[PDB]
Amino acid sequence: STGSATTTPIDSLDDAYITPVQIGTPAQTLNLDFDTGSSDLWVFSSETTASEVDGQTIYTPSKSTTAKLLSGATWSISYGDGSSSSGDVYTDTVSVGGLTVTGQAVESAKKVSSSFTEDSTIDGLLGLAFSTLNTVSPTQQKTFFDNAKASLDSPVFTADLGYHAPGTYNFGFIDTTAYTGSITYTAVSTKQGFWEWTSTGYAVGSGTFKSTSIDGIADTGTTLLYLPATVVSAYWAQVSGAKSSSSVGGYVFPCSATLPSFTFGVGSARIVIPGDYIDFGPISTGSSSCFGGIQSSAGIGINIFGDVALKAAFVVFNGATTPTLGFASK
Q: Is 113 helix (H, G, I), strand (E, B) or coil?
A: coil
Nearest to 86 by CA among 105, 70, 107, 68: 107
Overall number of domains in the chain: 2
Residue ranges of alpha helices (H) inside the chain are 114-117, 144-148, 229-236, 307-310
- How crowded is the C-beta side of 288, counted as CA atoms within 13 Å? 4
Pick from 213, 216, 223, 202: nearest CA to 273: 202
Its domain, for residue 263, covers: 175-330
Does 146 lie in the same domain as 180?
no
Domain boundary among 148, 174, 200: 174
Q: Which of 111, 139, 174 is the last residue of a domain?
A: 174
- Give one DSSP letter per residue of 189-256, joined into a string: B-TTSS-EEEEEEEEETTSPPEEEEEEEEE-TT--SEEE-HHHHHHHHTTSTT-EEETTTTEEEEETT
For this structure, is 199 an active site residue?
yes
For residues 170 and 180, membership in a common domain is answered with no
Co-location of 136 and 210 in the same domain: no
Cβ pair 184, 326 in contact under 8 A: yes
Phi-psi sector, 135: left (phi>0), alpha (psi -120 to 50), beta: alpha
Question: Are residues 134 and 111 part of one domain?
Answer: yes
Active-site position among 14, 33, 35, 88: 35
What is the Cα–Cα distance from 188 to 128, expressed in whole angstroms? 14
Q: Do residues 211 and 278 lie in contact, with contact meaning Cβ atoms separated by under 8 Å?
A: no
Amino acid sitting at position 265? G
Looking at the structure, do residues 30 and 147 belong to the same domain, yes or no?
yes
Last residue of a domain, one of 124, 146, 174: 174
Contact indicator for 327, 183 with CB cutoff of 8 Å: yes
Whether the Cβ atoms of residue 305 and residue 217 lie closer than 8 Å to each other: yes
Strand 99-112 relative to strand 124-127, pairing: unpaired
Same domain, 132 and 23: yes
Residue 143 and residue 43 share a domain: yes
What resolution does the deposited structure have, in angstroms?
Answer: 1.3
Q: Same domain for 89 and 192?
A: no
For residues 315 and 327, the answer to whether their CB atoms sit within 8 Å is: yes
CA dihedral angle for residue 302, residue 307, residue 313, residue 314, rounded to 10 degrees? 100
What's the full length of the chain, in residues? Answer: 330
Interatomic CA distance for residues 226 and 195, integer angstroms: 15
Q: Is 260 helix (H, G, I), strand (E, B) or coil?
A: coil
Q: Which of 95, 108, 131, 199 is catalytic?
A: 199
Q: Residue 44 is part of a domain; what is its CATH number?
A: 2.40.70.10
